[PDB]
């Protein structure tokens, strides 16, 4: 049965202009949730898209698909253009949850250089994913720019084979999971400007 839950709603904030400010929301959800952000009701980050390809690979199976996803929104050079209503929206195809906060900027940002030629950021990721042994699972990372992806599992490189698939969007697809696949999976995003890393966690639950 579908469940979706915010871990901690956004708080209203008065913030100094010109200084980078970061919002975060964590969402627990069954099945997997996607997160997107709105500014005064308009989408500014993320998407509504769900992982339908994994639902295909598990079509006909009993699916556990539970865990927590996390996402960050970075306001680089907070000016008056950035004062308004910030919204984090969680979505899992059956349910939607939304937490909304007012951000007011005090001051301007004349000095601020913004994220020109700045390292990539990982703005959305699977914090934990639970799935039943024998099913396909996916660990998600998304970056704010075009990047190349490299995945590690418990300090070992992940290469494409019959089990693992590193998709170019930042998904790690893991077929036919078994208890030994449990642990931390590290996504590394690179471009010409730097790299960002983020840890995800997979728990293969018991088959009954």
């Amino acid at each position: 049965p579908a469940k979706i839950k915010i871990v901690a709603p956004l708080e209203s904030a008065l913030i100094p202009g010109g200084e980078t400010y970061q919002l975060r929301c964590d969402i627990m959800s069954t099945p997997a949730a996607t997160i997107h952000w709105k500014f005064n009701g308009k989408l500014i980050q993320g998407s509504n898209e769900l992982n339908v390809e994994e639902k295909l690979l598990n079509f006909g199976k009993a699916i556990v698909d539970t865990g927590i996803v996390a996402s960050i929104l970075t306001i680089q050079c907070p000016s008056a253009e950035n004062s308004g209503t910030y919204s984090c929206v969680g979505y899992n195809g059956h349910q939607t949850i939304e937490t909304v906060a007012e951000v007011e900027i005090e001051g301007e940002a004349s000095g601020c250089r913004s994220n020109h030629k700045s390292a990539p950021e990982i703005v959305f990721w699977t914090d934990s994913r639970f799935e039943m042994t024998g099913n396909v699972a996916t660990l998600v990372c998304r970056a704010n720019q075009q990047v190349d992806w490299v995945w590690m599992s418990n300090d070992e490189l992940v290469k494409n084979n019959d089990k693992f698939t590193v998709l170019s969007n930042g998904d790690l697809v893991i077929k036919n999971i078994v208890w030994d696949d449990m642990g931390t999976y590290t996504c590394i995003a690179r471009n010409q400007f730097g790299e960002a890393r983020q840890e995800t966690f997979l728990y293969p639950t018991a088959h009954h």
């Binding site: 469940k3 839950k5 871990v7 627990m28 556990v64 539970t66 865990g67 927590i68 914090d127 934990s128 639970f130 039943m132 042994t133 418990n154 300090d155 208890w179 449990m182 642990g183 931390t184 840890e199 966690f201 728990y203 293969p204 639950t205 018991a206 088959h207 009954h208």
Partner: protein
């Protein structure tokens, strides 16, 4: 053992998200320790700290 480093923290976050105030923190720490040492089912993990 290397994997278990994050596992207890991750399970306890999941359990506290599922139960909310209904889950005593040191009791969830036990679920995490038990289920990061042995494979538990989805059914147990989600309802052990708050069966009501």
């Amino acid at each position: 053992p290397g994997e278990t480093r994050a596992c207890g923290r991750k399970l306890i976050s999941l359990v506290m998200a599922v139960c909310g105030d209904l889950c005593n923190p040191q009791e969830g720490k036990d679920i995490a320790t038990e289920c990061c040492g042995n494979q538990c089912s989805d059914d147990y993990i989600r309802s052990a700290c708050c069966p009501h």
